[PDB]
């Protein structure tokens, strides 16, 4: 089965796992730091999605070292995941356009 489509899926499943683990770890890392707001799971999950898509509203963000390290992993996983989907869409268009020319 087409690799680009398989990697896209794998990418989606993996991103969903990173979001959940990131939500868990962000809370674990931020509690104990005075002033921290990334401290309950439901909003932490919203924050992770917010970060992965790189939207970053600024309603929530990490203030501790480990919270930031978790944030980086989430940003990168999201950028990579969506970037991989774009790449797969490119392979589909390239392959089909070849057909449209015969090859």
């Amino acid at each position, epitope marked *: 089965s087409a690799l680009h489509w398989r990697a896209a899926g794998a990418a989606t499943v993996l991103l969903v796992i990173v979001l959940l683990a990131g939500s*868990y770890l962000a*809370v*674990l890392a*931020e*509690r*104990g*730091a*005075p*002033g*921290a*707001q990334l*401290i*309950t*799971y*439901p909003r932490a999950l919203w924050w992770s999605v917010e970060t992965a898509t790189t939207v970053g509203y600024g309603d929530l963000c990490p203030v501790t070292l480990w919270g930031r390290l978790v944030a980086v992993v989430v940003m990168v996983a999201g950028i990579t995941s969506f970037g991989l989907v774009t790449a797969a869409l490119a392979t589909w268009f390239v392959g089909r356009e070849q057909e449209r020319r015969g090859h």
Partner: antibody
Amino acid sequence: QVQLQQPGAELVKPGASVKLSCKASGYTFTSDWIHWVKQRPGHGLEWIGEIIPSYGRANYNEKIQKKATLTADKSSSTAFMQLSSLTSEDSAVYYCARERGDGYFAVWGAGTTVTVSS
Amino acid sequence: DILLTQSPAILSVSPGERVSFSCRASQSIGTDIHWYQQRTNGSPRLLIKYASESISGIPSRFSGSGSGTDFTLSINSVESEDIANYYCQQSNRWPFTFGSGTKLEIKR
């Protein structure tokens, strides 16, 4: 059924230490935090600290002298709080409460009355 | 560290009347405020979560409202069983903190 079981009382000699327990039942999730709150007769609720069993990390109220140490035994669903070198100022009712990681204390224990006397 | 002010400390009301407890936060905390009831010799009991959300098992008589820095816990038609201490608690910023408490008193 009672979700958080705490012993009714503990007598402690000044300077000595004691270990309070709080065993849970009912639904337990990876996201649960067990909190400890101190209440002096006639006064209000004071947050002491918290611990997440599924991981084992604990945080404490920074504004007060640290006289507590929290631990959790995953196998017997019990959270413990070690108070050490107590004086009369430590005499109070100590409650444990469970929080599902969403900020509010859904359920509280009956509380353990601790008296520091000779 | 967020400070929660509950004033007045004591509130007197006549049976059946409407009562309101106030809780003021030192800084804006959305609706991350929760209310607890503690009868004499009893442990705290959750009444309202997130400023206005109902909890199952709590008389529909209880309601909360507010957002930002000002919060209100209301009881419509007070009665003897409501005599207790009422506390607000915030979960917006670490560490969680409690208000100083407001005693409900009935005039019969």
